[PDB]
Amino acid sequence: ATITGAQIVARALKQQGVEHMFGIVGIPVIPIAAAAQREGIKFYGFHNEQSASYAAGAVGYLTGRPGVCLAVSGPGMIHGIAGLANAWSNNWPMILIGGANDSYQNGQGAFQEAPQIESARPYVKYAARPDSIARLPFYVEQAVRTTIYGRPGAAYLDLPGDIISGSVEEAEVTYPGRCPEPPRTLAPEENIKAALAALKTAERPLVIVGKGAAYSRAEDEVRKFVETTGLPYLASPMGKGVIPDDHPQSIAAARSFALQNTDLVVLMGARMNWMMHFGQPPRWNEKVRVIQMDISAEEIGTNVPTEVALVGDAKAITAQLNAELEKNPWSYPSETTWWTGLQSKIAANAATVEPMFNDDSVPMGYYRVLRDIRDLIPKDAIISNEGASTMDIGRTVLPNFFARTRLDAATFGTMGVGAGQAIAAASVHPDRKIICVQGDSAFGFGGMEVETAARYGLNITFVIINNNGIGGGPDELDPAHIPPGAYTPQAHYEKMADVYGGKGYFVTTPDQLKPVLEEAMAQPKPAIVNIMISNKSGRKPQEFGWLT
Amino acid sequence: MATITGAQIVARALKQQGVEHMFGIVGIPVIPIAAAAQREGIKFYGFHNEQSASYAAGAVGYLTGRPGVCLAVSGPGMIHGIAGLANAWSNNWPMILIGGANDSYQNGQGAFQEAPQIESARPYVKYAARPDSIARLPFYVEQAVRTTIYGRPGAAYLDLPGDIISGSVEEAEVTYPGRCPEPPRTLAPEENIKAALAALKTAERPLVIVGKGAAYSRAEDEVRKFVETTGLPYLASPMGKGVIPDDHPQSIAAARSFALQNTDLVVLMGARMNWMMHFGQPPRWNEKVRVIQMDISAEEIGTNVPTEVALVGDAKAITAQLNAELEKNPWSYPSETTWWTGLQSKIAANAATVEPMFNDDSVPMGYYRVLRDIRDLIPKDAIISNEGASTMDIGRTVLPNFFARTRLDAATFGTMGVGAGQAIAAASVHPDRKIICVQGDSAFGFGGMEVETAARYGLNITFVIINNNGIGGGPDELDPAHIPPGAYTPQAHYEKMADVYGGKGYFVTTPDQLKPVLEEAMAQPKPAIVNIMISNKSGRKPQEFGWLTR
Amino acid sequence: MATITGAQIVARALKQQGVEHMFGIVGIPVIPIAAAAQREGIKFYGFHNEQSASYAAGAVGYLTGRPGVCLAVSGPGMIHGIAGLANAWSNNWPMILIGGANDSYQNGQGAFQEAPQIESARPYVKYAARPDSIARLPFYVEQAVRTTIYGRPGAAYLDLPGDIISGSVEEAEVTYPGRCPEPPRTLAPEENIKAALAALKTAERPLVIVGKGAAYSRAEDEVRKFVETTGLPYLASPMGKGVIPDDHPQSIAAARSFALQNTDLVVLMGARMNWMMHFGQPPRWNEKVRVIQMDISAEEIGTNVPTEVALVGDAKAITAQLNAELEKNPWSYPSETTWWTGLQSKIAANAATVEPMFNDDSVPMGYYRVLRDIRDLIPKDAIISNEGASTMDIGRTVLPNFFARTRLDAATFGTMGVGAGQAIAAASVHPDRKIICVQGDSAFGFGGMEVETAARYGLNITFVIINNNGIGGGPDELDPAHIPPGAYTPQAHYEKMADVYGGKGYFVTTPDQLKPVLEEAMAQPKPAIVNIMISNKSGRKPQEFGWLTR
Ligand SMILES: Nc1ncnc2c1ncn2[C@@H]1O[C@H](COP(=O)(O)OP(=O)(O)O)[C@@H](O)[C@H]1O
Ligand SMILES: Nc1ncnc2c1ncn2[C@@H]1O[C@H](COP(=O)(O)OP(=O)(O)O)[C@@H](O)[C@H]1O
Ligand SMILES: Nc1ncnc2c1ncn2[C@@H]1O[C@H](COP(=O)(O)OP(=O)(O)O)[C@@H](O)[C@H]1O
Ligand SMILES: Cc1ncc(C[n+]2csc(CCOP(=O)(O)OP(=O)(O)O)c2C)c(N)n1
Ligand SMILES: Cc1ncc(C[n+]2csc(CCOP(=O)(O)OP(=O)(O)O)c2C)c(N)n1
Ligand SMILES: Cc1ncc(C[n+]2csc(CCOP(=O)(O)OP(=O)(O)O)c2C)c(N)n1
Ligand SMILES: [Ca+2]
Ligand SMILES: [Ca+2]
Ligand SMILES: [Ca+2]
């Protein structure tokens, strides 16, 4: 009895916990997608490997197991490099399976012959071309384990066409057991005590909850830590939901004031990178003290020195903090000038955005549109929010009540992930509603994938906030001097719903928002809501821009 | 106010980060770097080839837990140093290669020694960076140092253009980070600690393997207490020798092939299941062997063979967890089992086989007769640089180590060319110790010129060459039309190289010369070279399996 | 029928492709490759370090127009050989590095010397490939050879796993390509030939520069006929020396800085406007200089300075076009111009400055006094391996070359470590010639062990060391607490290294020793080593500009 290399890899992937595969078929990976379906792996055929590679990385973040992207040789694999880099930037587990020309045709100028290993090298923790068919399960298990052990990351498997279509005896093939979950590593006890001792000396302490705690499934231990200590906390863009965004101790409406004045910050799975302004002045105080919790030891002390390094798993380390807090109880006083200054800043920004929510001007503004979107999103729904102002204002206006329920451009600030991450969320959570909120430019990067979501019957609603271009476009286009960031004025993107027989809606006035969004979200097929806004609407004014 | 050059900034930053030694060769454009380093108190060693200097930097990283620094000129100087980057990459040792580069405003012009040096170092480094400006040089130095010692230790590369080295900025606009502290010693979950000890109590033929990862973690005291308390048989890796003294009664080194082939549960303390351990696979292991793996690299867990209990973290801290759990729940392996009896029987058989080889006075001499006098005259706390094939492999079993991190060999990469460089690195780290360099005649040739480097800097090194006329032996006379590829000049008098620097060189052929020559040579104020001729038929003890599993 | 191993296939394919020499060091897994190569008639040279062996392979490529082959073991052996790949990359010389690799079925296991060797060689090679199967080995060998010599010549790398080397296939399923013929000598458009000659007739101060690209193209006869017919002044690049005999009356080598600074039109015959020619930019050139560029690489045209007439193609064929067009439309530069007068005046001034330096009998001696006796005793057709800084730069101007491709120096990459390797390469290519190796004391240390390699293979090489106690000089006594970074042991007796292989070593300090020592040394049946001490204050002739433009 024989078995093909495609049937070996599909059986090895399924045994290693792979349940979702995204990509596009063709020479030579056609039998791999067929064998994947026979093993129970759900395969999603995309319209471009770029979006499919982004969807695989989102699965790794949502599940702790690598999403798999399948691509053909040459240009197909290169399109999927975008997913490798995005998973590399966010430390997400992901595997790109790229076909390759037959091994005995190397050097001949074979069909789509390309240096695919060296192309994937800068963004992968692991890259391998399996030497033989019988050893395929070795490479599948080693790639899966490398993506999820240590600091999570991406891997690339280079499959020549003759390894895929060739056959061996089943008795030759050894299959490793399913890769167990890695051990949740602890921090030394003297560091746990030093972290709590430093918190007792702080006058203006602050907790920052990043998506590292979300990936670590640490939402329970993190909330118990914040509530026991009574510390004010700031959630990162994709860290919101780990603690419900309606929590009384959130200081999200005073973000700039909190970062600028805190004297001790606890980074719970969050990097002091561009998203946190490198922890440097003027966005921070020059003498801010840092307690850093991260599984990557190399990340400790980046840009600003770390006083207490907590290297290890976020859930296990936070469990250490809560256990020591039970032995020596401590909590931050609820009546301090730090709290008074924080709440005073929260009330000032609350009154600033209050009239924006109730502004019925036409063309509409961001806050008026997102208010009706916010009030219709189910509490357990997954939010795919992409764009510039559409994503930034949606970050503050759209709350998350559970961890790992927001997917945005993330660390790499990538446009082109919206529809793919929405499809990834739908595959992981088939019992939930997926709300995709994109800017008009962000929608164009992968707009064809709305047919992909409809083809597989995914419960996704596509909302487009349109201001006629990248950060806005004019109402009329001078055909001689077209602004480089502008698109066709009032482009009817909702008409793309007619491609697959869905319902598209065009919205310009505030009275349409609530009935259109409610009706579109109840459609059996994915609906597209195209909402026009003024090219002059913007976020709440700030002392500092987000790009330091 | 006052200004400062990039070279002086780099030297000051390196000194703040704990760098005391710098090995390399000067030239355009890194001359002021070595000058400023000596001005700061950093001892610079001028080698004869950057290849040997880069190997020395990686050995300093293993011996100290702090990155050894190699300084190389642009182009071919940095490329010569990639060998050391790759060797530190293979052994997970901390080191920094500081390579000069052509002036940035001359890129694309065909500048002097213009080369893609970042991309050349990329496959073997955890961190490669060209500092963008002179003022941010301390940022890159601290980031490189921290990346080499945090997490799984490894190599890094700093690409310094000439204008960044020779240019100047005001001192007021330069910020120096604090000295990078040692990384936290990571613990394993207490459930895994109990699971590892509970698995040991189910094993009928358990085995402990002590690797050089436990040596790098400075975990010798915890590793010894663990093996003594449990009473378990233990095997030392080639550079794991010394963590527990090699004369320990629980060592089964003389029954290595038997222990690996019959153990049912092995505890890997800082050692990989790579080519050295035959991938943990049959026929060298049992196909159902259970593994307790202790490693700082989570990605290493489960390689080749599955791991039953994973102990991810620092060896010293995790071994302290095992010892603490043993004091709470005592247990020890019995001293009277059939496992001990089979191990002791195999030890006595291999001891009887090699016993007459130690006393064979035949000329040309054999490995065991020569290594016997080296073993018995070496200071008990000396540091051994052992390199070659049979010279290193037989020297591994014959020459014992009683302290951790006192043996330096070809290591995981099996590299020829590290012998003299690692001996120089050991001397620079331990100036109060005697360094013994035991190389085969071929391995000595890879970096033989560096004997003058050791003499120039007054290092307490004694060079011993075990010469069989080539790579694994060569004939006594050479056919000019049929010279074997691995042969050298018969009776090559390498000891005459001691006359280059005014040292003494010895030529040994008969056993009556061994003891008086080695005694006088080791007492010389200059590095002596003892060229000992051996038979080209001499080889190691016969084994059922070769060391290279394939 | 009969079977054949991959090693025997590689050796047979290399022999068919014209490979006669193979330099390197054997070991796992490339032992049968060197054995099969010797079985085929390929002469194998066992070096002491692959670094020097890889430099030797590139020198063979320059001397023959056919790729020199370097054989290296897996891991660190191949990484040592990257230095030669980079040197061939910098000089556009054909060479192949054949590096072994671990067994393919052991990838990912931590196999012996497992390393990303393709990616390590990538930045410096035109072609890197791991043969997919044993039967297709001749395909990869011919493709590698052809890629090294077709187009702009360069380096290539072949990654051979151990199982591909030791495995066997039937001979019937192996196809061997024909011997790769020499590439066609490409012509320039006849409109560009006329445009180049018409531009020459408008120049008031024209200059011809002969580079080693014209030497590689075997274009010496056409280049000499071109310069003689036109009567133009010509300057020879460092390794362009010998294309036209250096005693030619039209050479303006003694007025180099004046010629470059005042020429209004230059003809580049196989020479780049890189760091050697100071990028063709002021202050070393006039900002309005016109350029006629002759190069096989179209991408090189117009680098740094614009090219008025582009002559893309083979130097020999294009120079033959210029000579053919000159016979059809005769022209020559007049022998009586102010340009000639200024050049001749500058030559006589520099000759008068260095004339007493040649005759200075002061002790410690100077460069010019020592190089005078080397120049006057060298055989007129000898091949010179000159390496170092001042030793190489002054030796470039003092030691003349009368035949093309008879000087081998640090070349474009300015590499230290090529001296002995290139001397061995020259001897292997020209066994009927005397090879003279003139190195500084520092450059000798980079590959000093290879003197035994030259002696073991009976090569007619004489090693001369110009010793000033370090890199650019060192003190007479060393302060143990303040050793300069570029200093070595004072009065280091490197000549004692000749006693390693039974040769004769000489120590020279006074001028009365120069002539009798050099005469006796060059007549020795074994490679002699002449260690000549010079003053640490001796330097080259004073110049207005330094050689390093920055
Ligand atoms: N299981 C885990 N436990 C702890 N930290 C983790 C874990 N997984 C990833 N991390 C770390 O969390 C950090 C996330 O940083 P970042 O993505 O910048 O957060 P955010 O963007 O939400 O601020 C990464 O540095 C990563 O090393
Ligand atoms: N501080 C540390 N604590 C625990 N393990 C470590 C530490 N530093 C390195 N290691 C691990 O030790 C292992 C050493 O394995 P190896 O070099 O194969 O040892 P040997 O060659 O002696 O068998 C590496 O895999 C490395 O991840
Ligand atoms: N057969 C050939 N015909 C013409 N030009 C060639 C040939 N082979 C190589 N070249 C060119 O000659 C040039 C040599 O330049 P370079 O090495 O800088 O010479 P030098 O160092 O002597 O100035 C290279 O740019 C190369 O492209
Ligand atoms: C791959 C990629 N290409 C380009 C960009 C730059 N970029 C950031 S936001 C954006 C589009 C902004 O327009 P839109 O999404 O419609 O948002 P809004 O106008 O509401 O801000 C672009 C092109 C990017 N981040 N990623
Ligand atoms: C950089 C490098 N080049 C080549 C080799 C191959 N190699 C392994 S051992 C050895 C030399 C063996 O001879 P010697 O050191 O004299 O020891 P002996 O076995 O003869 O005692 C060589 C060249 C290597 N391991 N590393
Ligand atoms: C591979 C490499 N390492 C280092 C250098 C830097 N370098 C240039 S010349 C030189 C040695 C100069 O001394 P020596 O050869 O003795 O000549 P001298 O100038 O003293 O006559 C060195 C180390 C280099 N060019 N290449
Ligand atoms: Ca927009
Ligand atoms: Ca030997
Ligand atoms: Ca010198």
* 3-class DSSP assignment, residue B214: helix
Residue at token pair 């007479």: C476
- Retrieve residue C247's tokens: 């005693």
Q: Cα Rg for chain A, rounded, in angstroms? A: 24
User: Does the beta-carbon distance from A103 to C143 stay under 8 Å?
Assistant: no
Do residues C350 and C255 touch, judged by C-beta distance below 8 A? Answer: yes
CA of C54, closest CA in chain B: separation in Å? 12
Cα A109 → chain centroid: 38
Chain-chain contact of C108 with A139 (C-beta, under 8 angstroms): yes
Q: Is the CB of A468 under 6 A from ligand 4?
A: no
Please work out whether the CB of residue A405 comes within 6 Å of at least one atom of ligand 4: no
Considering only CB atoms, A107 lies closest to which of C105, C118, C139, namely C139
What is the rounded (10 degree) CA torsion for C78, C84, C87, C89? -60
Choose the closest CB to B83 out of C25, C79, C124: C79
Helices B514-522, B367-377: axis angle to 10 degrees equals 40
Alpha carbon nearest to ligand 4 atom 24, residue: A415
Distance in angstroms (rounded) separating the CA atoms of residues A109 and C109: 31
Identify the closest residue of chain C to B304 by CA–CA distance: C109
**Distance between start and end Cα atoms, chain C:** 66
What is the end-to-end Cα distance of chain B in Å, rounded? 66
CA of B226: how far to CAs of B127, B197, B222, B233, in Å? 36, 11, 6, 11
Handedness of CA A498, A499, A505, A507 (dihedral sign): negative
The pair of three-digit structure tokens given for residue A363, joined into one six-digit string: 């063309």
Across the interface, do B184 and A182 touch by the CB < 8 Å criterion? no
C431 burial via Cβ count (<10 Å: 0-12, 13-18, 19+): exposed
The Cα A372–Cα A321 span in angstroms is 40
How far is the centre of ligand 4, averaged over its atoms, from the C-alpha of A467 (Å)? 12
- State how far residue B138 is from chain A, nearest Cα, in angstroms: 11
CA distance C57 to C95: 6
Judge whether B55 and B415 are in contact, CB under 8 Å.
yes
Q: Mind spelling out the 3-state secondary structure of A357-393?
A: HCCCCCCECHHHHHHHHHCCCCCCCEEEEECCHHHHH
Best mutation site among B62, B212, B279, B299 for ligand 2, i.e. most ligand atoms within 8 A of its Cβ? B212
Q: How far apart are CA B67 and CA B148, in angstroms?
A: 6
- Residues in CB range of C446: below 8 A, 6 or more apart: B48, B49, B449, C52, C416, C417, C419
User: Two tokens at B237?
Assistant: 């890796």
Query: What are φ and ψ of residue B407, in 5° steps?
Result: -130, 130
Identify all chain B residues contacting C500, using CB atoms and an 8 Å cutoff: 489, 492-494, 496-497
CA distance B346 to chain C (A): 28
Which positions in chain C touch A117 (Cβ < 8 Å)? 119
The contacts of residue A457 (CB under 8 Å, 6+ apart) are none
Could you give the strand order of the β-sheet that contains C383-387, starting from the edge strand earlier in sequence?
C407-408, C383-387, C435-440, C461-467, C529-533, C505-508
């440097």: which residue's tokens? A280
DSSP 8-state code for residue A409:
S
Closest listed residue to residue A57, CA positions, set A332, A395, A545, A428: A428
Residue A502 identity: G
Q: Does C471 reach chain B within 8 Å, measured CB to CB?
A: yes
Q: How far is the CA of B58 from the CAs of A296, B82, B87, B411, in angstroms?
A: 23, 11, 7, 11
Distance of CA A295 to the CA centre of its chain: 18
Q: Is the CB of B388 under 6 A from ligand 5?
A: yes
Distance, in Å, from the CA atom of A76 to the CA atom of A112, rounded to the nearest integer, reads: 9
Ligand of minimum distance to the alpha carbon of A302: 1
Q: Distance (Å, rounded) from C-alpha A436 to C-alpha A438?
A: 6
Place of tokens 């080539």: B470
B397 lines ligand 5 (CB under 6 A): no
Nearest bound ligand to the CA of residue C539: 6
Cα distance between residue B137 and residue B169, in whole Å: 11
- List CB contacts (< 8 A) between A106 and chain C: 129, 132
Tokens representing C144 are: 């590698």
Does C296 contact ligand 3 (Cβ within 6 A)? Answer: yes
Atom of ligand 2 nearest to the CA of B316: 3
Of A146, A310, A316, the CB nearest to B299: A146
Residues of C numbered 74-103 whose beta carbons fall under 8 angstroms of chain B's beta carbons: which are they?
Answer: 75-77, 79-80, 82-83, 86-87, 90, 103
Q: Which of A90, A18, A36, A106 is closest to A412 using CA atoms?
A: A90
Mutation test residue for ligand 1: of A61, A294, A391, A404, the one with most atoms within 8 Å of CB: A294
Write out chain A residues lying below 8 Å of C119, CB-based.
117-118, 121
- Give Cα separations from C372 to A198, B52, B63, C443, C510 (angstroms): 76, 35, 51, 21, 14
| Cα dihedral sign, A67-A73-A77-A79 | negative
Burial A248-282 (b: 16+ CB within 10 A, else e): ebbbbbbbebbbbbbebbbbbbbbbeebbbbbeee
User: How far, in Å, CA of A381 to CA of B102, rounded?
Assistant: 56
Burial, A139: exposed, middle or buried (Cβ in 10 Å; 0-12, 13-18, 19+)?
Answer: buried
3-state SS assignment for residue A136: helix
Q: Distance between CA A159 and CA A29 in Å, rounded?
A: 9
**C439: Cβ–Cβ under 8 A, 6 or more apart, which residues?**
C385, C386, C387, C388, C391, C419, C420, C463, C464, C465, C466
B236 within 8 A of B251, measured Cβ to Cβ: yes
Residue spans of alpha helices (H) in C22-106: 31-39, 50-64, 76-80, 82-91
Q: Which of C76, C109, C452 sits opposite B86 (nearest CB)?
A: C76
CB of B186 less than 8 A from some CB of C: no
Chain B residues with CB-CB distance to C27 below 8 A: 416, 471, 486
Strands (E), B338-489: 383-387, 407-408, 435-440, 461-467
Contacts of B37 (CB under 8 A, 6+ apart): B11, B14, B15, B22, B44, B71
Helix, coil or strand: residue A476 = coil
**Which stretches does DSSP call E strand in C374-471?**
383-387, 407-408, 435-440, 461-467
CA distances from B494 to B457, B508, C429 (A): 21, 12, 29
Q: Which of C413, C471, C494, C526 to mutate to test the interface with B (most CBs of B within 10 A)?
A: C413
**Are the beta carbons of C58 and C84 closer than 8 angstroms?**
yes
* SS3 of chain B: helix, strand, coil, percent, to 5: 40, 15, 40
What does residue A99 show for φ and ψ, rounded to 5 degrees?
Answer: -65, 165
Q: Is A114 on the interface with C (CB under 8 A)?
A: no
3-state DSSP assignment of residue A161: helix
Q: Which chains touch B (3 or more CB pairs under 8 A)?
A: A, C
Report CB contact under 8 Å: B413, C76: yes
Pocket test for ligand 3, best of C208, C272, C396 (most atoms within 8 A of CB): C272
Query: Which token pair is B93?
Result: 């040792």
The neighbours of chain C, by the rule of 3 or more Cβ pairs under 8 Å, are A, B
What lies within 8 Å, CB to CB, of C222 at 6+ separation is: C315, C316, C319, C320, C323
How many Å apart are CA A245 and CA B370, to the nearest integer? 75
**Residue A118 contacts B, CB cutoff 8 Å:** no
Q: Are A194 and A24 in contact (CB under 8 A)?
A: no
C424 touches chain B (CB under 8 A): no
Long-range contacts of B311-314 (CB under 8 A, 24+ apart): B311/A183, B311/B188, B311/B192, B311/B193, B311/B196, B312/A182, B312/A183, B312/A185, B312/B186, B312/B188, B313/A185, B313/A186, B313/B185, B313/B186, B313/B187, B313/B188, B314/B185, B314/B186, B314/B187, B314/B217, B314/B219
HEC sequence for A68-128:
EEEECCCHHHHHCHHHHHHHHHHCCCEEEEEEECCHHHCCCCCCCCCCHHHHHHHHCCEEE
Give the DSSP letter of residue A342. H
Expt. technique: X-ray
Tell me how far CA of residue C195 lies from CA of A239, C224, C293, C377, C396, in angstroms.
69, 21, 12, 45, 34
Distance between CA atoms of residues C379 and C5, nearest Å: 46
